[PDB]
A paper describes a structure:
Ctf18-RFC belongs to the RFC family of AAA+ ATPase clamp loaders, which are involved in the loading and unloading of clamps onto dsDNA. Compared to other clamp loaders, Ctf18-RFC contains two additional subunits, Ctf8 and Dcc1, which bind to the C-terminus of Ctf18 to form the Ctf18-1-8 module. It has been shown that the Ctf18-1-8 module binds the N-terminal catalytic domain of Pol2 (30,31), the largest subunit of the leading strand Pol ϵ, and that this interaction increases the clamp loader activity of Ctf18-RFC.
We therefore used cryo-EM to solve the structure of the Ctf18-1-8 module in complex with the complete catalytic domain of Pol2 (residues 1–1192, henceforth Pol2CAT) to 4.2 Å resolution. This is the largest Pol ϵ/Ctf18-RFC complex that can be structurally analyzed due to the large-scale flexibility of both Pol ϵ and Ctf18-RFC. Our structure reveals that the complete Ctf18-1-8/Pol2CAT complex has a large interface burying an area of 1363 Å2, which is more than double the 612 Å2 area buried in the minimal complex. Dcc1WH3 interacts with Pol2EXO as previously observed, but this interface is now further stabilized by the Pol2 fingers subdomain (Pol2FINGERS). Furthermore, entirely new interactions are formed by the Ctf18-1-8 triple-barrel domain (TBD), which has rotated towards the polymerase to interact with Pol2EXO and the Pol2 thumb (Pol2THUMB) subdomain in two discontinuous interaction patches. Unlike the Dcc1WH3-Pol2EXO and TBD-Pol2THUMB interfaces, which are mostly electrostatic in nature and show few specific interactions, the TBD-Pol2EXO patch is well-ordered and displays hydrophobic and backbone interactions involving highly-conserved amino acids. This interface centers on an extension of the Pol2EXO beta-sheet into the upper beta-barrel of Ctf18-1-8, via a beta-strand formed by the conserved 730V(R/K)(R/K)732 motif in Ctf18, resulting in a distorted four-protein anti-parallel beta-sheet. Comparing our DNA-free structure of Pol2CAT with the crystal structure of the DNA- and nucleotide-trapped Pol2CAT shows movements of the Pol2THUMB, Pol2PALM and Pol2FINGERS subdomains that are characteristic of B-family DNA polymerases. The large interface suggested that this might be a stable interaction, and so we measured the affinity between Ctf18-1-8 and Pol2CAT by isothermal titration calorimetry. This showed that Ctf18-1-8 forms a tight complex with Pol2CAT with a KD of 40 nM, approximately 30-fold stronger than the 1.3 μM KD measured for the truncated Pol2(1–528) construct.
Author numbering:
A (entry chain B): 2 to 242, 247 to 380
B (entry chain A): 31 to 89, 112 to 212, 242 to 539, 548 to 689, 752 to 1057, 1064 to 1112, 1136 to 1186
C (entry chain E): 715 to 740
D (entry chain D): 2 to 133
């Protein structure tokens, strides 16, 4: 038998974490660069996540009402003999364990979308001589390289690079930055003009040739389209792989449509035809793309059935009833496919979208369209 | 009289309803053809009906009903149907109706709205079965008040009673064929059922629990105590409101999910004080607009308390959210049903009163063990440990919500789809009244005039035997211990003679197939012949048993439909006077026995009564039809079970509606089960519209005769152990031919258990009604005769063991008590034991739960009795040492005995109550149920029996305890459970401190 | 010396899931 | 802030040692769950000294006062834990649905170390009885 002993003082550093089958597979992988890392945005407020090299789980502690004692085996330093009490079914002692910890909770892991903590990361608009400006402001926070950013972000490396590329992250003059929408698309426009001006293979672009093509006839001190900018535009509007980029053409057209909405039709509800004409005329010559207004669904609204006007999702409320109120103020009757990407952000329950709409407002159908009226 | 006040109440309710989203919808005029088969042309709106209430409406007021609807589009509305109330007057002299008319002409100076001549069937009248009809005057009135004044006008004449509990909403729902839970397009012509939508819509569901202040060691009293928290859940989202004048810290957001099936993410609203908490609660209710609000015993605790604090803060709950107490003191609204789950628990869950607490229902039905906290620690913790208290509150709300959603909601709503009532009423009425209502529907649709409510005076002990119960043997019986069988060879002779026809019957009646298509008749029949012949040779046998239970499928309803039993079939001094009689030859009437019992000296007399085989079939048709629809849903259930597994595993792929379908048909079949079973008890209720003591007697005596025939067979071929009303527990020899499977031509196999088929065959030999008739040509009064019998035994088992107790009384057993165990060792049924009885020691419960399973260990009778001897000696060591071998803390906790007072103090409980009266004030005991926690102390010596419960929670304890009393208590239990059955099994007293009296030896062959 | 025992909880209870902060670990 | 889980040592030991055979891992670990509160003395150094020598119920090992609080006897899946002179607990060895993992937060060096991974647990769900 094994004698069970207890110490007068337990180490509270020992804690129990649930290991799912997938976690076990991850755990038994020596290949990984980083195995697992606990991450948090701050010390006192934000949630704590557990990250592997490519996935993120949020941790939740679950208390229980039982006494849970972990015992480790130990070899007694001096031979110790115990008296026999009226105990039945006792084999000879062969090893000894001691309860060294008393745990009251477990750490459950739930899969969640990793996000970057963009607290101290400033916005770059393509200003000349920006190194001076980073000291015109008092940014104590230092981010030399992107790996340091990822290290201090609640996400994995792959998630980090994907989100960083998605939000158009870059680095200028050794300072990490986030490109403004305007200057990023302007750099895209000039790049496409130069790429089609030099008849480059848009499916097999590399950094050097395009960077050389953009900054050929402008001074380097006043040429903000550096090699890092090139890497960002390629990693944002193209897909890499000896890895080369191929353009995401429908995506580029969609971005371009968002840009057109934000610059030209953000204050008036133009008829769709004239907007499509002007929109079409803004592209660099011979760019291969077709268009339909549904490729900007979720970025616009329709005051009447045949007109379009820009709306930014960021300006919408987070209170459900208020946001629905303002949505119905913009449009009394909505098309379903127009309003669906606009409401995705409010509740993650995974229900039928119609049920999601049915908490405040109500649906009403017709021939093919279903509109929503808050009565 | 109170017309103008009812109009004021109506207008206030209209304002409440419109504030909560129930505006009056009036569909457009539509001059076209009211047709029910085509729906898509007619202008209007489709809605799922969720409630209805009687009301009075203005242009003097007009009677009508408001119906509350949800829709396929997520919205809601109400619409109103108007209907003239009416009732009938019957005359005893038709020829002078004109004189009676003139009389009432005078009596009803202004009350009358209209009048009309109509004809209905009267089943008390001679030659009514040949089409002679009764002529009635239908009298209509503007509202229920006028009806009640008319009845008040008519009562002195009758001095010198009809329709008094016919709810107006019921009358309209029946006449219009409207049921809550069904889908309608609402139109000007009336409601057109949408047969295409069957799946329920999804209401907003609210469940709530409050936490209140209370004084130390007393109960909350709503005149002075305050609410400290209210938790609630709405459609899987949790909310918690806190009164921070009392709760001493801000509670933070948290998750409570006791099973993955039941997610609970709670958002917290920390409000500054009580009035703000109330305003947030009411405002949230208005925000979300619930149509069900659920509680657990909220009618007796939560709601009146909320009302009195609401009044104290000058708020009007009726004005705020439309809930108010009704005439019964129950809390009702117009627009939102109040589903207090406790009513469902008490009526339909099938549990003893000792298990009617939230804990036992939660554990039994939702399947987990919630957090428990002593109230004395709950109040200080409000200040000191607020998180733990808040965990308790939300656990309460989670339990109530998922109990409601999984069990009460499908059940009540499915019951409403066949019974003409709203959810509140369907929840609260007796099952007899539900039965009554279904029959009223059937009667209205068959143009049958309803009988008046019985009013005859209560032969003081009308309490006839309802069921027969017998204890035949006590003891442990097990599949690995041998038993003696004494086979009656003339029983095997009867069986061998009957065998070809018994198997043919099995094939063709039991299985609804044909012998024509059976592959293996002769093989099976030889195999059985050999087994019976072997049993025949060695007929005094000692071998291992088969422990079976056989039980007739739905005994009393099947007796009723087989014998065509209904109240109108009872002769009542006349039959065959005007209808032809020789066609069954026994003048039409089939005589059947019942047992009459007068108590005056007490006497039972066997009697016989005639059941007319030609009487109008409306009662029995409701039972046959209801039985078939339930079978239908059991079938559909099985098809759906196949559908839920055949398909792919992507659980979220638009097949959670199919699971809702499954749940639905489950609910409808269980709803038919409970309504079906309420048909026996309905016929004996006071004030029944279809009262017949004779009918109950006929049913009980028939079932007793059938089950005794089964007893006489099993007693000749095996050993019956216990019998209760409609079930037989028995053992058969292992050599008896048992289960086979015939192979069909399609390759399928049909199951055969021969004891069951031999019994069903004998039932059909002896109790088939060969006289069932049915109108083949109704215009010409042509009857057809055939043979009906739907009574079938079915078999469950075989089991591993059975344990039966014995009485303390000479030659007497104990009814309504036994224990049975499944093959895996788990407990299948426990009836009657101390666990169920009021007043028992938790230690004794722990004892019995230990001891029952230990009889399955060992290989011999002596080894099993030795094992229980050893546990007896274990218990003797604990009890003989007067508790010395036991820590002081564990004992004091364990001392509680619990007793409900069924009445008020105004027994051993009573004196304690009286002393509680003395201690906490008589008002404390003015209500029943205070803390009845006690121990029997050795001292003071010579105290009276009624003094035995002494309040002790207020309190060398080991010398105070009367251990001999408790050993005698344990002895009593041991007598019932171990030693006296041992004696009846010829084992000498394993607990010598309780001695075997002479009589128990005498009882057995000794 | 013989004063070691378990005060039995009548039923198993599992508490509410809670969020974790950095300070919760240290 | 952020910190890695160090699991190299446990992983290397796991790959180089055989699969877990009994309820105890090769590194010598066991958990334990009790439906209740284990009522223990609030002090130990003073009370470990008055225990008579024959009992050895309160022993001293490397300057730490360990209490000998029970004995464990494993018979297949069944397990019994004897506590003190007056307690007997009956329980079972159950295979964990979710393999638990014990770790260790070194606050000093801000290092986290994987200690071990469980697969079984010894549970006792019934009221304690005397040792007989
Ligand atoms: S028994 Fe038959 S013949 Fe007689 S009254 Fe009844 S129905 Fe008529």
């Amino acid at each position: 038998s094994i004698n069970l002993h207890s110490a007068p003082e337990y180490d509270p550093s020992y804690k129990l974490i649930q290991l799912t089958p997938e976690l076990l597979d991850i755990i038994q992988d020596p290949v990984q660069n980083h195995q697992l890392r606990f991450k948090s945005l701050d010390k006192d407020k934000s949630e704590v996540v557990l990250c592997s090299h490519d996935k993120t789980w949020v941790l939740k502690q679950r208390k229980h009402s039982n006494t849970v004692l972990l015992m480790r085996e130990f070899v007694p330093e001096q031979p110790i003999t115990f008296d026999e009490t009226l105990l039945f079914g006792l084999s000879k002692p062969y090893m000894d364990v001691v309860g060294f910890a008393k745990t009251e909770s477990e750490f459950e892991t739930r899969e969640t979308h990793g996000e970057l903590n963009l607290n101290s990361v400033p916005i770059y608009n393509g200003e000349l001589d920006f190194s001076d400006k980073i000291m015109k402001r008092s940014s104590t926070k230092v981010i030399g390289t992107l790996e340091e950013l990822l290290e201090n972000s609640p996400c994995s490396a792959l998630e980090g690079i994907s989100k960083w590329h998605k939000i158009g992250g870059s680095v200028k003059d050794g300072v990490l930055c986030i490109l403004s929408q305007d200057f990023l698309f302007k750099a895209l426009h000039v790049l496409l003009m130069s790429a089609m001006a030099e008849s480059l293979d848009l499916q097999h672009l590399n950094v050097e040739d395009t960077h050389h093509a953009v900054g050929k006839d402008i001074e380097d001190e006043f040429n903000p389209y550096t090699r890092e900018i090139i890497e960002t535009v390629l990693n944002k509007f193209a897909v890499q792989e000896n890895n080369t980029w191929r353009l995401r053409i429908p995506f580029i057209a969609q971005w371009y449509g968002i840009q057109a909405l934000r610059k030209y039709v953000s204050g008036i509800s133009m008829p769709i035809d004239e907007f499509l004409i002007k929109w079409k005329s803004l592209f660099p010559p011979f760019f291969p793309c077709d268009i339909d207004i549904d490729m900007l669904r979720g970025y616009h609204f329709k005051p009447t059935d045949k007109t379009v006007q820009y709306i930014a999702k960021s300006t919408l409320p987070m209170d459900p009833k208020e946001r629905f109120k303002v949505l119905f103020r913009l449009q009394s009757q909505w098309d379903l496919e127009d309003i669906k990407p606009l409401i995705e952000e409010l509740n993650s329950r995974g229900m039928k979208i119609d049920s999601f709409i049915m908490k405040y407002a109500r649906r009403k159908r017709l021939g093919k369209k279903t509109v929503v009226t808050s009565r | 009289a109170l017309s103008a006040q009812q109009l004021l109440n109506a207008s206030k309710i209209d304002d409440i309803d419109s504030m909560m989203g129930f505006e009056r919808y009036v569909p457009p005029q539509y001059n076209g053809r009211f047709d029910a088969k085509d729906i898509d042309q007619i202008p209007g709106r489709v809605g799922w009906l969720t409630n209805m209430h009687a009301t009075l409406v203005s242009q003097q007021g007009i009677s009508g009903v408001d119906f509350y609807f949800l829709d396929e589009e997520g919205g809601s509305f109400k619409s109103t149907v108007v209907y003239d109330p009416y009732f009938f007057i019957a005359c005893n002299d038709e020829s002078r109706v004109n004189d009676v008319e003139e009389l009432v002409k005078k009596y009803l100076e202004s009350c009358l709205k209209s009048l009309q001549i109509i004809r209905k069937e009267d089943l008390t009248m001679d030659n009514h079965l040949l089409g002679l009809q009764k002529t009635l005057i239908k009298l209509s009135f503007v509202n229920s008040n006028q009806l009640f004044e008319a009845r008040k006008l008519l009562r002195p004449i009758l001095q010198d009673i009809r329709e008094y509990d016919v709810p107006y909403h019921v009358r309209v729902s029946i006449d219009k064929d409207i049921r809550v839970g069904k889908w309608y397009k609402v139109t000007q012509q009336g409601f057109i059922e949408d047969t295409r939508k069957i799946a329920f819509a999804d209401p907003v569901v609210m469940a709530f629990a409050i936490a209140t202040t209370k004084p130390p060691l007393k109960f909350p009293d709503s005149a002075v105590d305050q609410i400290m928290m209210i938790s609630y859940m709405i459609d899987g989202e949790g909310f918690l409101i806190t009164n921070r004048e009392i709760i001493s810290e801000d509670i933070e957001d948290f998750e409570y999910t006791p099973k993955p099936e039941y997610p609970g993410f709670f958002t917290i609203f920390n409000e500054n004080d009580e009035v703000a908490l109330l305003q947030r609660f009411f405002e949230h209710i208005r925000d979300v607009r619930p149509t069900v609000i659920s509680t657990f015993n909220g009618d007796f605790f939560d709601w009146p308390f909320i009302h009195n604090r609401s009044k104290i803060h000058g708020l009007d709950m009726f004005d705020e959210i439309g809930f108010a107490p009704d005439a019964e003191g129950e809390y009702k609204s117009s627009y939102c049903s109040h589903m207090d789950c406790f009513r469902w628990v008490k009526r339909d869950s099938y549990l003893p009163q000792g298990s009617q607490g939230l804990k036992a229902v939660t554990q039994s039905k939702l399947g987990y063990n919630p957090i428990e906290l002593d109230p004395e620690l709950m109040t200080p913790y409000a200040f000191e440990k607020p998180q733990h208290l808040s965990e308790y509150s939300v656990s309460d709300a989670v339990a109530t919500y998922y109990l409601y959603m999984k069990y009460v909601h499908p059940f009540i709503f499915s019951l409403c789809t066949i019974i003409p009532l709203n959810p509140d009423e369907t929840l609260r009425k007796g099952t007899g009244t539900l039965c009554e209502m279904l029959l009223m529907v059937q009667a209205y649709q068959h143009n049958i005039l309803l009988p008046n409510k019985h009013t005859d005076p209560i032969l003081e002990s009308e309490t006839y035997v309802g069921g027969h119960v017998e204890s035949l043997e006590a003891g442990v019986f097990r599949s690995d211990l041998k038993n003696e069988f004494k086979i009656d060879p003339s029983a095997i002779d009867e069986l061998l003679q009957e065998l070809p026809e018994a198997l043919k019957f099995s094939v063709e009646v039991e299985n609804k197939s044909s012998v024509d298509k059976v592959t293996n008749f002769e093989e099976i029949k030889n195999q059985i012949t050999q087994k019976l012949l072997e049993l025949k040779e060695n007929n005094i046998r000692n071998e291992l048993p088969l422990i079976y239970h056989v039980d007739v499928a739905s005994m009393y309803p099947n007796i009723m439909t087989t014998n065509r039993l209904q109240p109108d079939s009872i002769k009542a001094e006349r039959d065959c006077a005007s209808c032809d009689f020789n066609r069954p030859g026994k003048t039409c009437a089939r005589k059947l026995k019942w047992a009459w019992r007068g108590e005056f000296v007490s006497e039972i007399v066997e009697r016989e009564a005639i059941v007319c085989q030609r009487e109008n079939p409306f009662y029995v048709d409701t039972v046959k039809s209801f039985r078939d629809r339930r079978y239908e849903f059991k079938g559909l259930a099985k098809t759906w079970k196949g559908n839920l597994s055949k398909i792919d595993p992507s659980d979220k792929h638009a097949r959670d509606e199919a699971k809702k379908m499954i749940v639905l048909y489950d609910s409808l079949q269980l709803a038919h089960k409970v309504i079906l079973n309420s048909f026996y008890g309905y016929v004996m209720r006071k004030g029944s519209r279809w009262y017949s003591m004779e009918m109950a007697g006929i049913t009980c005596l028939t079932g007793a005769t059938i089950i005794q025939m089964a007893r006489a067979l099993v007693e000749r071929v095996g050993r019956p152990l216990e019998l209760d009303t409609d079930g037989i527990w028995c053992i058969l020899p292992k050599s008896f031919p048992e289960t086979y499977f015939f192979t069909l031509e399609n390759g399928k196999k049909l199951y055969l258990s021969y004891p069951c088929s031999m019994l069903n065959y004998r039932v059909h030999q002896k109790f088939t009604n060969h006289q069932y008739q049915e109108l083949k040509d109704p215009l010409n009064y042509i009857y057809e005769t055939h043979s009906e019998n739907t009574i079938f035994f079915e078999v469950d088992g075989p089991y591993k063991a059975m344990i039966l107790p014995s009485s303390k009384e000479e030659g007497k057993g104990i009814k309504k008590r036994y224990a049975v165990f499944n093959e895996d060792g788990s407990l299948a049924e426990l009836k009657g034991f101390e666990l169920k009885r009021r007043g028992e020691l938790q230690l004794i419960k722990n004892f019995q739960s230990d001891i029952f399973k230990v009889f399955l260990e060992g290989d011999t009778l002596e080894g099993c009795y030795s094992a229980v001897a050893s546990v007896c000696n274990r218990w003797l060591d604990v009890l003989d040492s007067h508790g010395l071998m036991l820590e002081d803390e564990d004992l004091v906790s364990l001392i509680c005995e619990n007793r409900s007072m069924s009445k008020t103090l105004k027994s051993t409980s009573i004196t304690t109550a009286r002393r509680l009266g003395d201690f906490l004030g008589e008002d404390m005991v003015k209500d029943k149920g205070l803390q009845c926690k006690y121990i029997i102390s050795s001292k003071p010596f010579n105290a009276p029996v009624t003094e035995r419960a002494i309040p002790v929670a207020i309190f060398d304890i080991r010398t105070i305890i009367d251990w001999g009393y408790y050993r005698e208590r344990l002895g009593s239990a041991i007598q019932k459970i171990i030693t006296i059955p041992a004696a009846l099994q010829g084992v000498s007293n394993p607990v010598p401190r309780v001695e075997h009296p002479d009589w128990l030896k005498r009882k057995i062959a000794t | 010396t013989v004063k070691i025992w378990v005060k039995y909880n009548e039923g198993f209870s599992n508490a509410v899931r809670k969020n974790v902060t950095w300070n919760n670990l240290w | 802030p952020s910190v890695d889980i160090d699991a190299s040592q446990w992983q290397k030991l796991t790959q180089s040692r055989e699969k877990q055979t009994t309820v105890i891992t090769p590194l010598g670990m066991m958990m334990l769950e009790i439906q209740g509160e284990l009522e223990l003395p609030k002090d130990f150094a003073s009370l470990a000294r008055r225990d008579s020598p024959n009992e050895g119920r309160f022993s001293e090992q490397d300057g730490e006062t360990l209490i000998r609080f029970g004995s464990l006897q494993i018979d297949g899946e069944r397990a019994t834990l004897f506590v003190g002179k007056k307690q007997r607990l009956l329980g079972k060895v159950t295979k964990l649905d979710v393999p638990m993992g014990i770790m260790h937060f070194n606050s000093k060096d801000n290092k986290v170390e994987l200690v071990d991974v469980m697969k079984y647990k010894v549970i006792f769900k019934d009221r304690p009885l005397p040792i007989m």
